[PDB]
Amino acid sequence: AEYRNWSKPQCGITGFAPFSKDNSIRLSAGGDIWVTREPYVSCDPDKCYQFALGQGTTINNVHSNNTARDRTPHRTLLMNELGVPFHLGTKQVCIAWSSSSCHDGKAWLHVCITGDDKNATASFIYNGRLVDSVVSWSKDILRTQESECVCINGTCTVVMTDGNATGKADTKILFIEEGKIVHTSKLSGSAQHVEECSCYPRYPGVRCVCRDNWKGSNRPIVDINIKDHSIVSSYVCSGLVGDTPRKTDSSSSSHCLNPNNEKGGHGVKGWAFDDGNDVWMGRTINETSRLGYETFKVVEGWSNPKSKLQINRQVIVDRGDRSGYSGIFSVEGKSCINRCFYVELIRGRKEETEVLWTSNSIVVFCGTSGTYGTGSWPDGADLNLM
Amino acid sequence: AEYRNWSKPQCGITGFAPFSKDNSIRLSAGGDIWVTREPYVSCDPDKCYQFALGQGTTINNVHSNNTARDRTPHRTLLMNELGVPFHLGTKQVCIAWSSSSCHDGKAWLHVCITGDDKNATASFIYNGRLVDSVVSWSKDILRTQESECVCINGTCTVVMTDGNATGKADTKILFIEEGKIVHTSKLSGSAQHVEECSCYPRYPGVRCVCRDNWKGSNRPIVDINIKDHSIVSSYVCSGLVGDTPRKTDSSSSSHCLNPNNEKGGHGVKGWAFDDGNDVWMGRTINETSRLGYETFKVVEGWSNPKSKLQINRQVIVDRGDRSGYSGIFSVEGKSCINRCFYVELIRGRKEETEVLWTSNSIVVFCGTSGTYGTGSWPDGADLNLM
Amino acid sequence: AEYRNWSKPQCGITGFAPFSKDNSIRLSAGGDIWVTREPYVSCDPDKCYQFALGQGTTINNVHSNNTARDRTPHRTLLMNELGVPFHLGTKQVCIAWSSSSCHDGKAWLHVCITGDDKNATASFIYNGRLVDSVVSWSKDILRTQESECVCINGTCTVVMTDGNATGKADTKILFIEEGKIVHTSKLSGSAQHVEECSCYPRYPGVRCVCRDNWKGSNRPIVDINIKDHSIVSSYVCSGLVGDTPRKTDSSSSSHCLNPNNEKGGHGVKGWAFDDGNDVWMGRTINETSRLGYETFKVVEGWSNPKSKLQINRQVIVDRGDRSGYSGIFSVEGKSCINRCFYVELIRGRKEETEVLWTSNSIVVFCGTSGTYGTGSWPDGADLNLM
Amino acid sequence: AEYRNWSKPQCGITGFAPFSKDNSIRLSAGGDIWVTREPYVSCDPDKCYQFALGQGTTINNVHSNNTARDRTPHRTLLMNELGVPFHLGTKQVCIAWSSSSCHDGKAWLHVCITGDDKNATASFIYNGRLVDSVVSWSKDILRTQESECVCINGTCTVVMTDGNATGKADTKILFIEEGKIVHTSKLSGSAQHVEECSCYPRYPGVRCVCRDNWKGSNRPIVDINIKDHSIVSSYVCSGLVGDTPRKTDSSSSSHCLNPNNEKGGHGVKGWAFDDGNDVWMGRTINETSRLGYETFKVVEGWSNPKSKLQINRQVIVDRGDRSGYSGIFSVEGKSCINRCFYVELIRGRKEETEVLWTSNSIVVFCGTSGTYGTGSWPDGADLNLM
Amino acid sequence: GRLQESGGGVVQPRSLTLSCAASGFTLETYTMHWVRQTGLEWVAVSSKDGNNVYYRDSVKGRFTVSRDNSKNTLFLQMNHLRDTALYYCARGSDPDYDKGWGAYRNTDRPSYDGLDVWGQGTTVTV
Amino acid sequence: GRLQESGGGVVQPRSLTLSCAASGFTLETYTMHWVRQTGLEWVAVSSKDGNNVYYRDSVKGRFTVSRDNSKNTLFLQMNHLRDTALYYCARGSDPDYDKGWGAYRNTDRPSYDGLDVWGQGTTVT
Amino acid sequence: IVMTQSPLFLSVTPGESASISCRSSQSLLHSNGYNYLDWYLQKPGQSPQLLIYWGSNRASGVSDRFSGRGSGTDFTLTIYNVEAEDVGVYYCMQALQTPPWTFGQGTKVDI
Ligand SMILES: [Ca+2]
Ligand SMILES: [Ca+2]
Ligand SMILES: [Ca+2]
Ligand SMILES: [Ca+2]
């Protein structure tokens, strides 16, 4: 086995085709299924894995009560083959209430953050053993992507943030080789708040589309030079911004150097990736809540901030159905690198009071050069009957 | 690993011997078992796998209610080792309410259809990644075999139909290499309606016995030339027709160019394969409902439409017990290509009102050159106690 | 991978040490566990597997009711790694209400008998595919060892019986190569009734200690020449006979050409193996019921029918605790062939009416040249609380 | 695969980072989870495994009642991948109410003690087969480490004790090669009572930190020369003793030749390892009960009995939360041998009467040369709701 | 296998001997029954070895059932005939061995065969 | 292991010292009991170190149980005899350490041995 | 054991199904799990022939049109796709508690 280099072109994306759906919540009404949130998908060279941050309990479990709390010492990184629901045999790969993972072509890197809020610890588990750890540098919720890291030529990069949830924070880009932190780069450029980055290999570098929880409904971009460890950051130009909350399409504006200051506070983990000057991005259909999910291409959306020309729209989750975090992951094809994305389908508290617990299902779509129709793949759990 | 070529002869079938039985429904009364339908069996070079279209729920689950609906966005292709019941750890390999899969000798091809009825999408997942997709061409329930595709020399062929359920439809034969659609052939010949094809390798080509839902109780045949992609189609000559509904044996007639126009509407997924001029086929015993299941050889049944000479009859499911879809799959022996078949054992709604759900078990038989006795292997779930 | 030849000496047995225990019944009170009977143990070159004939249901299941019936079409051969309880993910390897399995060093042979009582079919599944089948020759419950076959140089031998349960029957020794029946030998010698043989490799041949259900409380011996397919049969000389029912030790007598005609009717699957002129054997402690289990060496027990000199007695199951079928299996060590045995721990109906079901746990002991103490390893399920 | 030699240095430990947490008890409220105690962690070259002594029942099971009893014939060594909770599919690797396991680089050695209290048997299962056994030599609860053995150059060493629970006992150090006991060494040196040793490879030898249940609250040390089989024993010098019960830090004294005779009776399985003249050790925060868990470095704690200089303290389990057994295990990194430790998180009877059962969860920490913060990772099951 | 009853005829309200000859199989292999039809009414049974018998209550002390396995012939010695019916000779349907003789129903692999072979029947009128 | 009681005999309604000599094992290794049979009636126990004792209520203040581990001899000093019985000397069955001495029943690996060795008994009348 | 059959007379249209019920005064289910209940057909002028044994086991050469079901005290014989050759009297027989072997009154089937 040789390190991944992702040294293939991004072949044509005409849109996205259905790939996987865990149906976790529906199954949990009739089985022992983990309570989860912050899911993501990452693939070793042969097959894809679904990850999630468990709450240390199953849904049909007295402990599933009050699982809205996002940081407990019982949260662990769940790891299954993609499409295997988080059943009781699910391997907990580390203790974490925030995590990221990539496969470098030889082994799995898991970056796992747990511990006290203001004094968290990030453990770096590579090939099944703890190789390194770093303490919170800003002492305010050290946190990472909640999606796959990007691992090129055995050098893995993970974006980690520490500091104000909705103010200036200290973001660093760690470069990990076989679990060892060999270099740490401070966030550089014009991105003013970076959280929950959705990163993909863009050879020779790594490109991250992240969450600005402070001032932008446009998503910050972080470009990572894996060779010299340089960092540059910006925002997605697209006038159709991808964050939630955001202003309506008619009244929304973007700026690919600065946050747009349009309903900038709060946000959601999302993703975008460039296709020449165009941008493929997903976002909740609902502008203020995490309801529905859509993906589309914005013509010139990667370079022209005034661009609102949308095309290739696909509804992934109907606007009446609950979306959540979404993130990118990349899959090496025969001759190109495909872009795929997952959507967290959040159900339960606080929004839905029919149940006491807070969990999610996932739906996974992959870029296609072929053709596709239309549909909607929500969680589909009837919480009233649960 | 080298591509399968199926370049061995079909050696003698004296009948069929018991191979596997999942007992899913019986187990579901005392365990977490998936609600399924449209099962099939496909084998990689080493071992056989049972597939099924889940309904996104277990049987003992409030969501198992109203699982008669055959197309939901929560339906997924379940995949287990043959004989492993669809428990909660079952891998959902893709989102699908219609699917087919073969192993080409190197990796698994999964053809997965989901999305809106009139705008479905067929995703082609090869070696664990989405390689291609095609949109519904007739915008009326794009649908595929519900049994294993046939994969020769790395070229996989799958029969896909779009259009009228019980009228003229648009059937195409896709040729897939490592998940990529390299060629599409329109259905050609005299078969007037082709659905749910049961295909097997017949080197150098592929032969499919399918379901005519419109005008024939005799089953259409589709012969596929994997080299030049030519298609020819016909009907099984056998005067003992294999579809359900059908006329009684005494009054039934067949025509191996045209549908027999004998209770032609509706049908069931079945299978047949040639043995020289004879035909081995299975069918429901009942001739109007999916009750019981029998297999037999019709002497000259592949070439003489007047032949009603039956031999080597075996009851697989007694006529009082519920059958369902059946399909062929082929297993490479030491010097042989063996023909095997599964039977879907449908239980529950609508026919059985004792329960709210609709699911199935499976029983799997394999061709034998040896000897065999008699038996009956129904589902055996006591739905009254469930 | 090479064919097993078992061409190593039997290493010295001082007794038997604890090896494994499934605890199935105890776990079933708090989990989904298969209803089973007729368990046995067989090992591939790397690790041991526990087999059992499921009843197509779990214990906590309305279908576990009336599981005393030993032949149903829902019985399947369960196969797990030894020590993994028969949970819902257990692979059903074939349809069978009677079965045997060995690994020839390359792949698993499963001999699986199912179908009608008087019209049974034995399916021979090798390396995951049905290779051969034979029909009942006497049309009265075709049945096989219920323990591992013995597979030497790719030639597998299985003892199969058809005919009177408690009268003259037709026993044959099938020789199978890669699942194909290459030769069938009729039982030859002085053994007058042979069932449920416990066979072990005794290079260059195979030796079986079986159950005489008709006239002997001494166990028949069948020696199988795998080269020329010759068969010779006799009875274990030991004056301490191993069958149940049997006469008390003081009043019991044996004859290693003929059945002893001492409480000969009925029996239990047991095992014995020679150590020079001595015999290692196990048997229920209770002489008339399947209560308790003991193993001991009978000095000269293999050659002198008057020998009642016992030594190296070990209680495996206390005489107050239920026992059942026991059988031998052999494990290749660094320099020897070790002898191991399992004991079926039958609980439930008919003997125990506190529950409606009939199932078993297993305890597995392996020959040791070292030292050992004493203990008792019964099932331990409190059926009153179940 | 080549035998482990552990011939790399112990790289710098700055402390310990979170590694794994099974959350077993919390999951058991909503799933079928084994009742366990005496857990430990051992790693093959690729990945780590969690072991535990099951009680032959799940927690939600009538048999979980009265699981405080530490020796039953239904206790088995459970083995899962680290992070996989002991669900129903957990492999029981042997019958044992006391056990140890290492991987020698080629295969798993399991030392499994079961049978009668005064007549126990230790079975040695190597590479999936019983290779050796030894009978209790003192006829009073033969018992072993309850943590991983240490396996150097294919020679595995396990410390086994037989005799008085709280008086003079007969401790031996067995040297096992591929499951065969090739040498037995009696305990030698000044350690007066040795139980439940926590051993780690210290090339060229093996070092064990154990439990003195009789006279010392300081932990005995056993150094094992794997080459000449010589044994020397002593006590951890550290004035901060690691046993529970123990005197308060202010009033506690140690002696690294003799037990300190300070609340010496009883104890708990713990661990320590040298870092030059310093000692890394863990211990319950509470001096008399198994509440909380802390680790720290004692400057000169390995050579100066008067040293109470503590540094690098980490709370693993808050002092209000239940600790239990803890033990060391070692993981080979790229260039060094890391020290890791687990903590048994005991819940239930006798201390907690809200439930009838006695079980545990586990939390696993690994040595790090990086940095870390603070936290607490208790079991977190709210037994009032269970 | 085939059975052929004989000896039936007109008898006065006296004794009569019914014989049932087996061809194609050995009588020693099978439990043998006498079943009369006036519906079907079981009369008597003879064990395989010919050493055990059961009788219908209404014929106890009057009818004697015997066999000669060497001759493959089953006999029903009828005395004090009151009994008019068509008498069938049928093989199979062993009783429970736990009651003295027959099949071991409690064995792990119990077997049962019904009355799978019947004779054409011999008429007896009294 | 073998125990041999001695000193029993005819005593007027006075004192009598019973002795129990251990052979084949060291008395220091075992809790030692005195059990009399008039059924079986536990009388007194002596700790392994010889520093702790328990007495039957009816003999408290009259019987004194002692030992000399060097001599492998257990003693029962009987005073104010009213007590006619066959007096057995038996080893084992430690009391609970939590009550002052004996076995640690709350340890993870608790052990127990019954009265596995008895003397033939010395008659006292 | 008393064996009660119902109906005593049954008229069957050719090609349709026919069900004959049979009740025993006591359960015919043996502890070995098998119902010792047989079904016999006496076609007009012929000797009785075994159709079903042990409740649901078809005898050698018997068409799978005949289906025995039930357990304990209630048993049903179902004749699928009835034909003129199926006419006659069907007798259920218990073989659990013997002697005596007891038959039902016999259900007369006609077209
Ligand atoms: Ca924002
Ligand atoms: Ca049709
Ligand atoms: Ca016998
Ligand atoms: Ca201590």
If you write DSSP's letter for every residue of B119-175 in order, what string do you get?
EEEEEEEETTEEEEEEE-SSSS--EE-SS--EEETTEEEEEEEEE-SSS-EEEEEEE
Sign of the C-alpha dihedral computed for residues C165, C170, C173 and C176 taken in this order = negative
Catalytic residue (choose from A3, A32, A44, A70): A70
Residue at A30: amino acid letter: G
Distances, alpha carbon D356 to alpha carbons D62, D68, D347, in Å: 10, 9, 10
Binding-face residues of F in 85-124 toward D, CB within 8 A: 97, 103-104, 106-111, 113
What whole-number distance in Å separates Cα of residue B243 and Cα of residue B287? 8
Region for C298 from its dihedrals, namely left if φ exceeds 0, alpha if ψ lies in -120 to 50, beta otherwise:
beta
Helices within chain F (DSSP H only):
none
- The DSSP line for D237-289 is --SS---SS---TTT----SSS---SS-SS-----EEEETTEEEEEE-SSSSS
What whole-number distance in Å separates Cα of residue A119 and Cα of residue A137? 8
Contacts of D127 (CB under 8 A, 6+ apart): C46, D106, D107, D108, D178, D179
> Which residue in chain C is spatially nearest to B370 when comparing CA positions?
C133
What whole-number distance in Å separates Cα of residue A216 and Cα of residue B273? 64
Cβ atoms of C51 and C39 closer than 8 Å: yes
List the structure tokens of A176: 């990990």
The separation between CA A150 and the C-alpha centre of its own chain, rounded to angstroms, equals 12
Is B81 annotated among the ligand-binding residues? no
Q: In this structure, how many other beta carbons lie within 10 angstroms of the beta carbon of residue D152? A: 25
**DSSP state at residue G59:** P
Going by C-alpha positions, the residue among D11, D6, D43 that lies closest to residue D341 is D43
Q: Please give the helix or strand (H or E) that residue B184 lies within, else none.
A: strand B180-186
Sheet holding E16-23, edge to edge: E2-6, E16-23, E73-78, E63-68
- The DSSP line for D290-314 is SEEEEEEEETTTTT-TT---EEEEE
What whole-number distance in Å separates Cα of residue A287 and Cα of residue A263? 10
What whole-number distance in Å separates Cα of residue D367 and Cα of residue D330? 9
Cβ atoms of A101 and A51 closer than 8 Å: yes
Contact A378/B at CB under 8 A: yes
Expressed in angstroms and rounded, the spacing between residue C217 Cα and the centre of ligand 3 is 4
Is D325 part of the annotated catalytic residue set? Answer: yes
Residue at B203: amino acid letter: Y
What whole-number distance in Å separates Cα of residue B137 and Cα of residue B118? 9
The separation between CA B263 and the C-alpha centre of its own chain, rounded to angstroms, equals 21
Q: Name all chains with 3 or more CB-CB pairs below 8 Å to chain G.
A: B, C, E
List the structure tokens of B149: 């595709």
What whole-number distance in Å separates Cα of residue C188 and Cα of residue A261? 94
Is C235 part of the annotated catalytic residue set? Answer: no
Taking contacts as CB-CB distances below 8 angstroms, the residues of chain A near D60 are none
Ligand in closest contact with the CA of B242 = 2
Cβ atoms of C15 and D123 closer than 8 Å: no
Distances, alpha carbon B40 to alpha carbons B32, B106, F14, in Å: 21, 20, 97
Partner-chain contact B95 A363, CB within 8 Å: yes
Q: Which positions in chain G have a beta carbon within 8 angstroms of at least one beta carbon in chain B?
A: 15, 64-65, 67, 69, 78, 80
Q: In this structure, how many other beta carbons lie within 10 angstroms of the beta carbon of residue A123? A: 30
What whole-number distance in Å separates Cα of residue F5 and Cα of residue F21? 6
Q: Are strands A121-126 and A108-114 parallel, antiparallel or unpaired?
A: antiparallel
| Binding site per annotation, positions of C for substrate | 37, 71, 195-196, 211, 290
CA angle D55, D56, D58 (to 5 degrees): 90
Residue B181's SS3 state is strand
What whole-number distance in Å separates Cα of residue F101 and Cα of residue B111? 75
What whole-number distance in Å separates Cα of residue D90 and Cα of residue G12? 58
Cβ atoms of A32 and A6 closer than 8 Å: no
What whole-number distance in Å separates Cα of residue F17 and Cα of residue F65? 10
Taking contacts as CB-CB distances below 8 angstroms, the residues of chain D near A114 are 18, 375, 377
- The DSSP line for F39-59 is -EEEEEEE-TTSS-EEE-GGG
Q: Are strands D310-322 and E122-124 parallel, antiparallel or unpaired?
A: unpaired
CA angle D87, D93, D99 (to 5 degrees): 105
What whole-number distance in Å separates Cα of residue E6 and Cα of residue E19? 5
Going by C-alpha positions, the residue among F85, C136, C107 that lies closest to residue B373 is C136
Q: Name all chains with 3 or more CB-CB pairs below 8 Å to chain A.
A: B, D
Binding-face residues of D in 97-136 toward A, CB within 8 A: none
Going by C-alpha positions, the residue among C343, D365, F24, B281 that lies closest to residue A129 is D365
What whole-number distance in Å separates Cα of residue B48 and Cα of residue B54? 19
- The DSSP line for B235-269 is E---SS---SS---TTT----SSS---SS-SS---
Expressed in angstroms and rounded, the spacing between residue F91 Cα and the centre of ligand 4 is 27
Q: Determined by which method?
A: cryo-EM
Taking contacts as CB-CB distances below 8 angstroms, the residues of chain B near C60 are 30
Distances, alpha carbon D50 to alpha carbons D86, D91, D339, D364, in Å: 9, 11, 16, 10
**DSSP state at residue D24:** H
- The DSSP line for A244-280 is SS---TTT----SSS---SS-SS-----EEEETTEEE
Going by C-alpha positions, the residue among D124, D27, D127 that lies closest to residue A88 is D27
Q: Which of E39, E90, E93 sits opposite G91 (nearest CB)?
A: E39
**DSSP state at residue B35:** E
Sign of the C-alpha dihedral computed for residues C310, C315, C316 and C317 taken in this order = positive
Cβ atoms of B339 and B13 closer than 8 Å: yes
- Residue labelled with tokens 């020759």: C137
Residue B63's SS3 state is helix
Cβ atoms of D39 and D362 closer than 8 Å: yes
Phi/psi at D162 (5° precision): -145, 130
Going by C-alpha positions, the residue among C205, B62, B133 that lies closest to residue A368 is B133
For chain F, helix, strand, coil in percent to 5 are 5, 45, 50
What whole-number distance in Å separates Cα of residue B165 and Cα of residue C146? 50
CA angle E4, E9, E13 (to 5 degrees): 135
- Count Cβ atoms within 10 A of the Cβ of residue A81 and give its class: 0-12 exposed, 13-18 middle, 19 or more buried: middle
Residue at A28: amino acid letter: S
Beta bridge partners of D200: D207
- Residue labelled with tokens 């007295």: A62
Partner-chain contact B73 A377, CB within 8 Å: yes
What whole-number distance in Å separates Cα of residue A53 and Cα of residue A35? 8
Beta bridge partners of C338: C331
What whole-number distance in Å separates Cα of residue D220 and Cα of residue D117? 25
Cβ atoms of B320 and B279 closer than 8 Å: no
Q: How far does B171 lie from chain A, in Å, by closest CA? A: 17
What whole-number distance in Å separates Cα of residue F111 and Cα of residue F96? 11
Contact C333/D at CB under 8 A: yes
Q: In this structure, how many other beta carbons lie within 10 angstroms of the beta carbon of residue C7? A: 12
Beta bridge partners of G52: G39, G58
Contact E65/G at CB under 8 A: no
Cβ atoms of A372 and A16 closer than 8 Å: yes
What whole-number distance in Å separates Cα of residue A148 and Cα of residue D118? 55
Q: Please give the helix or strand (H or E) that residue D26 lies within, else none.
A: helix D24-28
How many Å is the maximal CA-CA distance in chain B?
55
Ligand in closest contact with the CA of C212 = 3
Distances, alpha carbon A136 to alpha carbons B82, B218, D318, D373, in Å: 49, 72, 20, 7
Going by C-alpha positions, the residue among E125, E115, E126 that lies closest to residue E35 is E115
List the structure tokens of A250: 């008619």
Going by C-alpha positions, the residue among C145, C273, C146, C268 that lies closest to residue C200 is C273
Phi/psi at A159 (5° precision): -90, 125
Contact C313/D at CB under 8 A: no
Is B319 annotated among the ligand-binding residues? no
What whole-number distance in Å separates Cα of residue D376 and Cα of residue A72? 9
Cis peptide before C172 (omega within 30 of 0): no
Q: In this structure, how many other beta carbons lie within 10 angstroms of the beta carbon of residue G111? A: 11
What whole-number distance in Å separates Cα of residue B42 and Cα of residue B145? 12
Taking contacts as CB-CB distances below 8 angstroms, the residues of chain D near F110 are 70, 165
Terminal C-alpha separation, chain F: 28
Partner-chain contact D116 C374, CB within 8 Å: yes
What whole-number distance in Å separates Cα of residue A70 and Cα of residue A37? 8
3-state secondary structure chain C: CCCCCCCCCECCCCEEEEEEECCHHHHHCCCCCEEEEEEEEEECCCCEEEEEEEEEEECCCHHHCCCCCCCCCCCEEEEEECCCCCCCCCEEEEECCEEEEEECCCCEEEEEEEEECCEEEEEEEECCEEEEEEECCCCCCCEECCCCCEEECCEEEEEEEEECCCCCEEEEEEEEECCEEEEEEECCCCCCCCEEEEEEEECCEEEEEEECCCCCCCCEEEEECCCCCCEEEEECCCCCCCCCCCCCCCCCCCCCCCCCCCCCCCCCCCCEEEECCEEEEEECCCCCCCEEEEEEEECCCCCCCCCCCEEEEEEEEEEEEECCCEEEEEEECCCCEEEEEEEEEEEECCCCCCCCCEEEEEEEEEEECCCCCCCCCCCCCCHHHC
Ligand in closest contact with the CA of A266 = 1
List the structure tokens of A367: 């870029």
What whole-number distance in Å separates Cα of residue G51 and Cα of residue G24? 18
Beta bridge partners of A314: A295
How many CA atoms are closer than 13 Å to the CA of A222, on its beta-carbon side? Answer: 36
- Count Cβ atoms within 10 A of the Cβ of residue A385 and give its class: 0-12 exposed, 13-18 middle, 19 or more buried: exposed
What whole-number distance in Å separates Cα of residue B343 and Cα of residue B373? 19
Q: In this structure, how many other beta carbons lie within 10 angstroms of the beta carbon of residue B335? A: 9
What whole-number distance in Å separates Cα of residue G88 and Cα of residue B309? 29
Taking contacts as CB-CB distances below 8 angstroms, the residues of chain C near E107 are 165-166, 213, 266
Distances, alpha carbon B57 to alpha carbons A348, A380, B33, B351, G4, in Å: 18, 10, 8, 20, 46
- Residue labelled with tokens 């290509």: B337
> Which residue in chain B is spatially nearest to A331 when comparing CA positions?
B129
Q: Please give the helix or strand (H or E) that residue B25 lies within, else none.
A: helix B24-28
Contacts of A71 (CB under 8 A, 6+ apart): A97, A98, A117, A141
Partner-chain contact B73 A376, CB within 8 Å: yes
Cβ atoms of A266 and A287 closer than 8 Å: no
- Count Cβ atoms within 10 A of the Cβ of residue G2 and give its class: 0-12 exposed, 13-18 middle, 19 or more buried: exposed
Sheet holding B15-21, edge to edge: B15-21, B358-368, B337-348, B326-332
Is A282 annotated among the ligand-binding residues? no
Size of interface A-B (CB pairs under 8 A): 159
List the structure tokens of B279: 């035909």
